[PDB]
Amino acid sequence: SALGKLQDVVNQNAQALNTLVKQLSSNFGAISSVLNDILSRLDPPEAEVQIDRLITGRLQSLQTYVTQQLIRAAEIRASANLAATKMSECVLGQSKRVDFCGKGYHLMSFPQSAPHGVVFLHVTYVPAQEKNFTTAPAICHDGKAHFPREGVFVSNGTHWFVTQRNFYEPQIITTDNTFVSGNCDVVIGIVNNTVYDP
Amino acid sequence: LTGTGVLTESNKKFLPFQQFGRDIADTTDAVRDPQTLEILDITPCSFGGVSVITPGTNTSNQVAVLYQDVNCTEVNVFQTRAGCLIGAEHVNNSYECDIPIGAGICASYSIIAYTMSLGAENSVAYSNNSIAIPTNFTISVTTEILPVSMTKTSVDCTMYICG
Amino acid sequence: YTMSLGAENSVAYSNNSIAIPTNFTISVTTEILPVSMTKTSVDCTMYICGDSTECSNLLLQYGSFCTQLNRALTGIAVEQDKNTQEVFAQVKQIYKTPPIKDFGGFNFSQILPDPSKPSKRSFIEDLLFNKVTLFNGLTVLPPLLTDEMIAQYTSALLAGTITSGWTFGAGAALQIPFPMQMAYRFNGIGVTQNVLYENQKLIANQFNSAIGKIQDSLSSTASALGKLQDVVNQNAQALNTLVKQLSSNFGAISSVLNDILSRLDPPEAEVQIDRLITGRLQSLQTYVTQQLIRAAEIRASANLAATKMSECVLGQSKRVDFCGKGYHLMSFPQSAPHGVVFLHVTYVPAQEKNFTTAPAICHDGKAHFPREGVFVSNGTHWFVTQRNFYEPQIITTDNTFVSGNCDVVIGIVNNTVYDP
Numbered sequence A: 001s002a003l004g005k006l007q008d009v010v011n012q013n014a015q016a017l018n019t020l021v022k023q024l025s026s027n028f029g030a031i032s033s034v035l036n037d038i039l040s041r042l043d044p045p046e047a048e049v050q051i052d053r054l055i056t057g058r059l060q061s062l063q064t065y066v067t068q069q070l071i072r073a074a075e076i077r078a079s080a081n082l083a084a085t086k087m088s089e090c091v092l093g094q095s096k097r098v099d100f101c102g103k104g105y106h107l108m109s110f111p112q113s114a115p116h117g118v119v120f121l122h123v124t125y126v127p128a129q130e131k132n133f134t135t136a137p138a139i140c141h142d143g144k145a146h147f148p149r150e151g152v153f154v155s156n157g158t159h160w161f162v163t164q165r166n167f168y169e170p171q172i173i174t175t176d177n178t179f180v181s182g183n184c185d186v187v188i189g190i191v192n193n194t195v196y197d198p
Numbered sequence B: 001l002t003g004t005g006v007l008t009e010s011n012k013k014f015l016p017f018q019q020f021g022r023d024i025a026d027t028t029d030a031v032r033d034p035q036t037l038e039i040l041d042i043t044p045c046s047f048g049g050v051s052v053i054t055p056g057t058n059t060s061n062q063v064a065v066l067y068q069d070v071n072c073t074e075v076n077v078f079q080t081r082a083g084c085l086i087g088a089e090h091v092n093n094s095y096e097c098d099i100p101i102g103a104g105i106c107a108s109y110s111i112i113a114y115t116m117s118l119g120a121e122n123s124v125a126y127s128n129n130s131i132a133i134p135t136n137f138t139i140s141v142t143t144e145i146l147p148v149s150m151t152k153t154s155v156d157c158t159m160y161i162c163g
Numbered sequence C: 001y002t003m004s005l006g007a008e009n010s011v012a013y014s015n016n017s018i019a020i021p022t023n024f025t026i027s028v029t030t031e032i033l034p035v036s037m038t039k040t041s042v043d044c045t046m047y048i049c050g051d052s053t054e055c056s057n058l059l060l061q062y063g064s065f066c067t068q069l070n071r072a073l074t075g076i077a078v079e080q081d082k083n084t085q086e087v088f089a090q091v092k093q094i095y096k097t098p099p100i101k102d103f104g105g106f107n108f109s110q111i112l113p114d115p116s117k118p119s120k121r122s123f124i125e126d127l128l129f130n131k132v133t134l135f136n137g138l139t140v141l142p143p144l145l146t147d148e149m150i151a152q153y154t155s156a157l158l159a160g161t162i163t164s165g166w167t168f169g170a171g172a173a174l175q176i177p178f179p180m181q182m183a184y185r186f187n188g189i190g191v192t193q194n195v196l197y198e199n200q201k202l203i204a205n206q207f208n209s210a211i212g213k214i215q216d217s218l219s220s221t222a223s224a225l226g227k228l229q230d231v232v233n234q235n236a237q238a239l240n241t242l243v244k245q246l247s248s249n250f251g252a253i254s255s256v257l258n259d260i261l262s263r264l265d266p267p268e269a270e271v272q273i274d275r276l277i278t279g280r281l282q283s284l285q286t287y288v289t290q291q292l293i294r295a296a297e298i299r300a301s302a303n304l305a306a307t308k309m310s311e312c313v314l315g316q317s318k319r320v321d322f323c324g325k326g327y328h329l330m331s332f333p334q335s336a337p338h339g340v341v342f343l344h345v346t347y348v349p350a351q352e353k354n355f356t357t358a359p360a361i362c363h364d365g366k367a368h369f370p371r372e373g374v375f376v377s378n379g380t381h382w383f384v385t386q387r388n389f390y391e392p393q394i395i396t397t398d399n400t401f402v403s404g405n406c407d408v409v410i411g412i413v414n415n416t417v418y419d420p
């Protein structure tokens, strides 16, 4: 029950064809479903009338089948356009869109051939083993406010560090990972600390 | 005019020259009986769809029968917004929807019927000076199946029709 | 008259001149997307015949048409359930807002559920649910997910978004205060965090005012939910047309079949019954085909809505105009009778000012280019700022890099570079 979409498409096409073949063997109000017997039993006017009724019914069945095939083809075309977009933006590159190529942070993708479709194996990065920390919007030092460059201020309880958002790699707060953009009277939640000067 | 349905008392007041009342889109709604000149509302007797809720013959042969949009007082018995259910025992718990019946009601295998659980309820420990940071990670491979094409079929109508 | 294509203005384009905004605007934009339509099931045997065994017996010679129509309608109904599930059941856990609301001044009471509990629904969703107004083999299948469950899904999405940012969309929810979430989103649009922290109160006030304006627009202005109304009106018109076609002569003697049975012997009557069967079958096939096309359109709209939820509610989108006019910050989903509504919070620059620029700075026979931002001049002195906001800073070796000399750069300007 993992390849349900392709199997469903194949089953729908086979069911449509079988329904068309069965519907070929429908009377549609005529004397018989076979034309040779109709010609043999009836005179040319009545046989022509019954044959004409059968023609109308069978053509109506063909119109319904063709319309269903066109609608299914539109759906399959939309799915194929989506698959081409996924192949382009996830196999030929890394996609920043959320959940377009799997849950979590997308890393890469690998396509695999299928009988009437494609299978994408999305390799993604999923964070785990979470831990609590105490933050602050900025660090107050020498009457100035320091904000992280590409990280965040956290504290394990006694000391403050700068770590990247998606992984816990604490580092000493220096001037090489923080920038100064004002004083300590406008930022809400600032905390007094020292900033290392290398 | 010959119809079929149930007759009931109607609070609508007609006009003396008016015999019967037609509902919107030209369907009969009420007819006044000529004998005592009383307004009687006519609505068709209950009809619906019969559905079967089953865990599949591989597991068990026990089934539950659902009558769609039918009040089963005139046909265990349970009443849902989707109709009436017979053969399923209602429970007060909540699990993941196994067999979707409708209107927030799902059945699972005896056959039980319950209200579907939207998911595990958890409260995030939000605070104005607290963060959660992951110290580890996992590499997850997810499989996505996308159809690309169907079988190409051609029909020769001239010979398809009658050979 | 002839259409006015828009306001005609000439941009003051010139070399070594830029316009840099000195202020921001927080804009909330409402977008409405249908997610599903009413699930209708039609029994062709009852619709075409209406309790006549001989009519049904005549209909058996027509083959399996009723089975195809019932299968198509059932496929449409399960398709609507699937679209609703894809749009609204993105998350697998029902996150809950904390009992205390301390989000740095931001107010979400109008989008979060209220203690009054009108089937556990927010005030905006109450406004939307009050702004939309909604027998012959026709049945209306109820949706699998009720309104309260859809409201609970949206409330969980709001709780996750306001307590964990985009972390819960990629896995386990990581709690984070709304101030640092907004700072991260500003970094997402190329604006430093200090811009947020300097004007946190102003940003919160602008966001609250924008939510109030959305409230007033939903309360007063009509036809705001015109897409969902058009969908339900088209469905109602299709059903009404089907019922009206049921009352059709179809080239017979009368549009009612019981009178045909009572006013003709069975042999003659069969012909008229056959004619009525053909006409009603044609009408039903036309209705089913139209419903299939409309269902495909609704499915496309719901796929679009699920995509918008996925990279605009569960994350920040860098795509232009996908989730709002401006630099997208975040989005909020709300329920609607047969669809979804996204409130896109976006960043709009405002109060621009003219400045004189240079591609690089010539100092000590070397060309200096900014690491991020642009070199600007206010007339006398040259500074370096960022593109989306005016934060003038002195030119320094820390925020500039050297990549050659001044003999190749077109537009080079002599200046001094401070070395700390």
Ligand SMILES: *[C@@H]1O[C@H](CO)[C@@H](O)[C@H](O)[C@H]1NC(C)=O
Residues within 6 Å of the ligand: A132, A133, A134, B130
């Ligand atoms: C994090 O979670 C633990 C476990 O509940 C709790 O004791 C602690 O107070 C939380 N906060 C911090 C900042 O550690």
Ligand SMILES: *[C@@H]1O[C@H](CO)[C@@H](O)[C@H](O)[C@H]1NC(C)=O
Residues within 6 Å of the ligand: A156, A157, A158, A159
């Ligand atoms: C926090 O980090 C500091 C620096 O690494 C360490 O000395 C200390 O033991 C840690 N734990 C606590 C509870 O302070």
Ligand SMILES: *[C@@H]1O[C@H](CO)[C@@H](O)[C@H](O)[C@H]1NC(C)=O
Residues within 6 Å of the ligand: A188, A189, B128, B129, C102
């Ligand atoms: C955070 O919340 C606590 C309790 O609600 C309060 O005492 C404290 O002042 C708040 N801090 C900030 C920076 O808002």
Ligand SMILES: *[C@@H]1O[C@H](CO)[C@@H](O)[C@H](O)[C@H]1NC(C)=O
Residues within 6 Å of the ligand: A140, A191, A192
């Ligand atoms: C930080 O230090 C300054 C003086 O250096 C003082 O005025 C201020 O109250 C301190 N803040 C805290 C939170 O201790």
Ligand SMILES: *[C@@H]1O[C@H](CO)[C@@H](O)[C@H](O)[C@H]1NC(C)=O
Residues within 6 Å of the ligand: B012, B013
């Ligand atoms: C008919 O109309 C009159 C006045 O227009 C009103 O008083 C009366 O109640 C109406 N009839 C019914 C049955 O409501």
Ligand SMILES: *[C@@H]1O[C@H](CO)[C@@H](O)[C@H](O)[C@H]1NC(C)=O
Residues within 6 Å of the ligand: B058, B059
């Ligand atoms: C399903 O069928 C297999 C093969 O006969 C059998 O082993 C299994 O027990 C069945 N499942 C259940 C739930 O009975």
Ligand SMILES: *[C@@H]1O[C@H](CO)[C@@H](O)[C@H](O)[C@H]1NC(C)=O
Residues within 6 Å of the ligand: B071, B072, B073
């Ligand atoms: C079914 O009929 C009973 C009999 O009066 C009634 O009490 C009940 O409310 C009905 N169920 C409905 C309308 O759902």
Ligand SMILES: *[C@@H]1O[C@H](CO)[C@@H](O)[C@H](O)[C@H]1NC(C)=O
Residues within 6 Å of the ligand: B090, B091, B092
């Ligand atoms: C479920 O809860 C209702 C609440 O009153 C109660 O009446 C009913 O008996 C309960 N059913 C079961 C099976 O416990």
Ligand SMILES: *[C@@H]1O[C@H](CO)[C@@H](O)[C@H](O)[C@H]1NC(C)=O
Residues within 6 Å of the ligand: B135, B136, B137, B138
């Ligand atoms: C992280 O998880 C892996 C397995 O998922 C485990 O082997 C490892 O010890 C964990 N911790 C670190 C620090 O890698």
Ligand SMILES: *[C@@H]1O[C@H](CO)[C@@H](O)[C@H](O)[C@H]1NC(C)=O
Residues within 6 Å of the ligand: C012, C019, C352, C353, C354
């Ligand atoms: C200055 O900016 C305004 C609008 O911001 C523009 O209309 C004008 O042409 C600019 N240049 C000048 C005044 O030289």
Ligand SMILES: *[C@@H]1O[C@H](CO)[C@@H](O)[C@H](O)[C@H]1NC(C)=O
Residues within 6 Å of the ligand: C022, C023, C024, C351
């Ligand atoms: C920016 O605009 C707000 C109102 O939108 C105003 O209160 C504020 O003073 C403006 N700031 C500047 C620097 O113009």
Ligand SMILES: *[C@@H]1O[C@H](CO)[C@@H](O)[C@H](O)[C@H]1NC(C)=O
Residues within 6 Å of the ligand: C107, C108, C109, C110
């Ligand atoms: C948020 O808005 C509601 C209604 O507009 C109001 O009652 C409430 O006081 C507001 N909260 C804050 C903190 O301003």
Ligand SMILES: *[C@@H]1O[C@H](CO)[C@@H](O)[C@H](O)[C@H]1NC(C)=O
Residues within 6 Å of the ligand: C378, C379, C380, C381
């Ligand atoms: C440009 O800005 C500097 C400092 O910001 C100031 O000293 C100087 O007077 C300004 N020049 C003009 C023409 O405004």
Ligand SMILES: *[C@@H]1O[C@H](CO)[C@@H](O)[C@H](O)[C@H]1NC(C)=O
Residues within 6 Å of the ligand: C015, C016, C410, C411, C412
């Ligand atoms: C800008 O263009 C003018 C001619 O239109 C030219 O004289 C001037 O040197 C140019 N300046 C720069 C910085 O390219």
Ligand SMILES: *[C@@H]1O[C@H](CO)[C@@H](O)[C@H](O)[C@H]1NC(C)=O
Residues within 6 Å of the ligand: C362, C412, C413, C414
């Ligand atoms: C910049 O300075 C150098 C030498 O200091 C000089 O040769 C050159 O002409 C100057 N360029 C401009 C545009 O003034």
